[PDB]
């Protein structure tokens, strides 16, 4: 308790055994028949476990550049030159740099924008995903790749991911949108 809270604080837990995911949460109807990706803590993004990476072996054989796309997003830009520089055993060297290289200080980041207030709010009140996608890319140069929505509406704080919803998918003013943005 943090009075001048509690279950409202944002958490992510790295699990070592996937089946221990049952104990991270309540009001969630635990069943060990259920594989990790279907469980409520994983759908909410509060639970990560190393097992969900084991498909990356396949993805490499079948699309190497899709792993390089992952590696560039999730590392924030660890290029082959940096791991060469680290393999030289000196540690990260570096100091004020040429504006030249500094040019790469502009990269796409994944980010979250809320539809509660702001230009996009309009789409929030009844709009459909589709509209947003278009308006956004068009006016702001921002791709929308999914939603993070509240599981309860009518009252817990938990939200869940929705990867790339349909064009006609209805929005709520409480939704948050995952986006790729250049600034």
């Amino acid at each position: 308790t943090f009075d001048d809270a509690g279950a409202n604080v944002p958490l992510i837990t790295e699990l070592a055994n996937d089946s221990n995911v049952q104990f991270l949460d309540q009001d969630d109807d635990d069943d060990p028949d259920t594989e990790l990706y279907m469980t409520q803590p994983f759908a909410c993004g509060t639970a990560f476990a190393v097992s969900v990476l084991d498909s990356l072996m396949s993805t490499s054989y079948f699309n190497d550049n899709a792993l390089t796309l992952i590696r560039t997003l999730i590392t924030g830009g660890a290029t082959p030159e940096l791991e060469q520089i680290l393999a030289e055993g000196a540690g990260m060297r570096g100091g004020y740099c040429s504006p030249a290289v500094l040019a790469n200080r502009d990269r796409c980041r994944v980010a979250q924008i809320s539809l509660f207030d702001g230009p996009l709010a309009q789409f929030g009140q009844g709009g459909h995903y589709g509209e947003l996608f278009v308006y956004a890319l068009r006016h702001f140069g921002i791709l929308c790749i999914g939603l993070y929505r509240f599981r309860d509406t009518n009252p817990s704080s938990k939200r869940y991911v929705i990867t790339n919803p349909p064009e006609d998918f209805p929005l709520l003013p409480t939704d948050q949108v995952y986006v790729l943005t250049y600034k």
């Binding site: 049952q22 635990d30 069943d31 060990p32």
Partner: protein, 213 residues
């Protein structure tokens, strides 16, 4: 893909590869005896039924050998000599290994059934003849009030003989189930929602008290 478990595929593989070969050898012995020997212009012959050959092969596979039925063609005999050397070799695996697998079943599977009038408590953690007997002796003592609570043990192991005896003596108000409170299916088996309380016992003589906690 109906046989899910590794032990089930193994057994079925053992059973069918024993019923085949047994039926097959009965057919081959039946052929050799009822044809007679070619060396003797088929004059030396013995009119067995196929069922008498099945019987004869079972009493020789088991190494009983009554000799009420016995082989008499030279080829037949041979085949019996070869067959004995094979089926003494198949005493590795088969009958002892299927008895092992078929014995490894779970004795204390199944579920509690909750009557409306009775209360129950679920007891788990360190369950053993000494801990259970010390618990039962106080929990059901004559000086205690005449309450009618049933005690449901839940534990991740087979009970020892003395514990099965203790459970038998109290079977009117005591049950035991194989399982663990770590599994939501076992919590349903013991109807934990309708349980009045749950008691977790500890191994006070463990190798590390902090791991037991």
């Amino acid at each position: 893909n109906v046989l899910k478990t590794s032990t089930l595929i193994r057994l079925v593989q053992l059973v069918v590869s024993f019923v085949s070969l047994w039926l097959t050898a009965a057919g081959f012995l039946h052929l050799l005896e009822n044809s007679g020997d070619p060396f003797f212009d088929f004059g030396n012959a013995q009119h067995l039924t196929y069922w008498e050959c099945l019987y004869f092969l079972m009493v020789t596979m088991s190494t009983v050998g009554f000799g009420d039925i016995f082989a008499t063609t030279v080829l037949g005999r041979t085949f019996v000599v070869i067959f004995i050397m094979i089926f003494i070799g198949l005493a590795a695996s088969f009958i002892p290994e299927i008895a092992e697998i078929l014995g490894k079943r779970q004795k204390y599977g199944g579920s509690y059934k909750k009557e409306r009038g009775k209360r129950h408590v679920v007891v788990c953690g360190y369950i053993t003849f000494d801990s259970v007997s010390n618990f039962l002796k106080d929990f059901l003592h004559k000086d205690r009030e005449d309450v009618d609570v049933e005690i449901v043990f839940l534990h991740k192991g087979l009970p020892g003989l003395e514990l099965e005896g203790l459970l038998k003596r109290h079977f009117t108000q005591v049950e035991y189930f194989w399982g663990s409170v770590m599994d939501a299916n076992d919590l349903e088996r013991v109807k934990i929602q309708e349980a009045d309380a749950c008691l977790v016992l500890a191994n006070k003589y463990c190798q590390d008290p902090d791991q037991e906690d």
